[PDB]
Design a binder for this molecule. Structure first.
Ligand SMILES: NC(=O)c1ccc[n+]([C@@H]2O[C@H](COP(=O)([O-])OP(=O)(O)OC[C@H]3O[C@@H](n4cnc5c(N)ncnc54)[C@H](OP(=O)(O)O)[C@@H]3O)[C@@H](O)[C@H]2O)c1
Ligand SMILES: NC(=O)c1ccc[n+]([C@@H]2O[C@H](COP(=O)([O-])OP(=O)(O)OC[C@H]3O[C@@H](n4cnc5c(N)ncnc54)[C@H](OP(=O)(O)O)[C@@H]3O)[C@@H](O)[C@H]2O)c1
Lengths: 315, 315
């Protein structure tokens, strides 16, 4: 049976999901939700999506919709995920699951009560380059001693990754550090037992910190260093360095390199080189098979606990 | 008057000082100290140094010797600096001033009692690339928001930067973090008021930490992130990222780049492109002029206090 999907938020990431979903057999997006009808309709027509709404509830009232993908602004995710599960729909939520621990806990509790698939978009789990390193670790061929990570944008304005203006404000802690806090514990195969952060001054017009530094230690002794900035005038995005016992690796999105700039071939690891498509394939596989997805709300939640502890430190 | 110098420690760095000193008028190295007479004699003959000793005291007993440069192993620096000042000789000590706060305090107290020039080799103050950034800051054209730093070696054995085996064991904190701990406060123009570190496991055969993560915050709100490793199988050394209000800069030894990898011309900043030579020029200028040097024991000592606080944290 074709799984019918509502997609909420036709921004840059919602577009990346729609483009990925075109490659996944037996899934169809039947409803598109976005803040402005005319702009939403233009996207729906480009993608052939029949239903267009300005409220998520309108798509939740459709009985045929089986699943929801949330690419809305972060501040809406937990409430909307809760609403989806109250309507009986599986839900995938873009990272972060929430910007508060309480709301992430409320989402986890409703998922536990419903037994529905609720997934968080920790795409780093699904990028082929990180999967390659992960598979070497599971094989016992590699152990992480230190991860050194830079998450940098030039974002003194409320802009997305394509340089377009946002109507909402982003956050260094809940959205960007979340990728690394989760991914470090995942790749180390060991829980985080120490975390320290420091932040710079709050920006007068955006109300968020523009610079942040995070340090993690896993119970097995692996450490991670993370630098975050919205002030970086250079190449935007995340660069990851794995320093291990048997090697060094540099991950740059879906690309992997040795510490000597030798590019490693990851095109063989998974059926797609697109991590967003692999994330959605895992989500829909879990729905069809009645299993938990990789990056379930349950799997990623200790990340949000660490983020809360860092936030309390920063205040 | 020619300033006569004793150099202690014909290692990789002692040779680099000798090559620099060859370009400094009115300075002459008359004594060379090293652990094995024949190897020290071979270097002395290559550089035309007449006196060869295996003990520093032999060079300190020479009445003609005016100054000492200490490029010995770190464990010896503080004691030897004290010996220099007790014999009435000016001294420059390679970084670190000491691997313990107590010994650094003893060197500072003897410097204060004697009023002799005692300098520490914080070469980052004198590299043309860092001087360029410092001068932009002094002009009020640039303010640091974040510094992101990687200090990496592949050093599972007691080897110097040329890959030759050392007879002594190195240390991530006191020797390597010291460059950045000092350089951050110096370039930020603001004292460090918060520091946090975590480290990996102690190495069975060397007895030292192989990985370390340090985070600093200055009183003005600027932050620093520092990753250190002896496990990095890649390009060895230090890479610096300055993220400021007006720009982004990448320092790689004496080279400087923008955040877009455009190389900046630093040949206009100072009379030499060799930071070690400029360090010695500053040392000899301060002796000749009867002034305090840049990177004096007094200027850098708060760095060693920060290092002590970090070691207490790690324990
Ligand atoms: N690595 C990853 O997996 C990854 C990457 C990027 C983003 N994300 C997450 O994805 C989310 C969105 O990111 P983005 O960069 O796509 O954002 P974006 O381009 O700024 O906008 C997302 C869309 O949500 C829409 N929207 C606003 N209010 C809405 C409402 N009430 N109902 C429905 N839609 C509404 C916006 O419409 P208007 O702007 O026209 O009002 C926009 O088109 C964020 O939470 C982000 O953290 C994850
Ligand atoms: N950025 C900088 O300015 C910078 C950079 C790197 C290091 N340094 C510091 O500079 C110092 C030396 O570094 P390196 O790489 O040159 O060290 P190195 O190559 O390991 O050795 C320095 C020399 O000292 C000699 N030595 C040993 N015992 C001695 C003794 N009792 N009396 C006299 N000489 C003796 C060693 O001889 P054997 O090998 O025969 O013992 C060696 O030839 C270290 O403290 C290091 O931290 C500064």
């Amino acid at each position: 049976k074709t799984i019918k999907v509502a997609l909420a938020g036709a921004g840059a990431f919602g577009i990346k999901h729609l483009d990925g979903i075109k490659n996944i057999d037996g899934v169809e997006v039947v409803s598109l939700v976005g803040r402005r009808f005319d702009q939403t309709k233009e996207v729906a027509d480009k993608y052939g999506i029949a239903h267009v709404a300005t409220d998520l509830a309108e798509s939740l009232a459709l009985p045929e919709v089986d699943a929801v993908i949330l690419c809305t602004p972060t501040q809406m995710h937990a409430e909307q995920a809760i609403a989806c599960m109250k309507a009986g729909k599986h839900v995938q939520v873009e990272i972060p699951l929430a910007d508060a621990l309480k709301d992430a806990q409320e989402v986890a509790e409703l998922q536990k009560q419903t037994g529905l698939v609720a997934m968080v978009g920790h795409t780093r789990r699904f990028n082929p380059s990180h999967q390659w390193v992960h598979k070497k670790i599971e094989a016992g061929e590699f152990n992480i001693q230190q991860m050194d990570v830079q998450t940098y944008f030039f974002r003194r304005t409320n802009m997305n990754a394509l340089g377009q203006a946002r109507s909402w404000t982003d956050h260094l802690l809940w959205h960007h550090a979340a990728h690394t806090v989760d991914l470090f514990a995942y790749q180390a195969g060991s829980p985080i037992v120490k975390a320290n952060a420091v932040q710079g001054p709050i920006h007068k017009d955006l109300g968020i910190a523009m610079d942040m530094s995070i340090q993690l230690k896993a119970a097995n002794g692996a450490i991670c260093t993370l630098s975050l900035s919205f002030n970086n005038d250079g190449p935007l995005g995340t660069f990851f360095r794995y320093i291990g016992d048997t090697g060094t690796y540099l991950a740059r999105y879906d690309d992997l390199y040795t510490g000597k700039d030798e590019k490693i071939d990851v095109s063989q690891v998974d059926v797609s080189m697109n991590g967003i498509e692999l994330q959605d394939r895992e989500f829909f596989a879990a729905i069809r098979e009645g299993r938990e997805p990789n990056s379930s709300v349950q799997q990623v939640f200790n990340c949000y606990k660490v983020l809360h502890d860092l936030e309390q430190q920063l205040n």
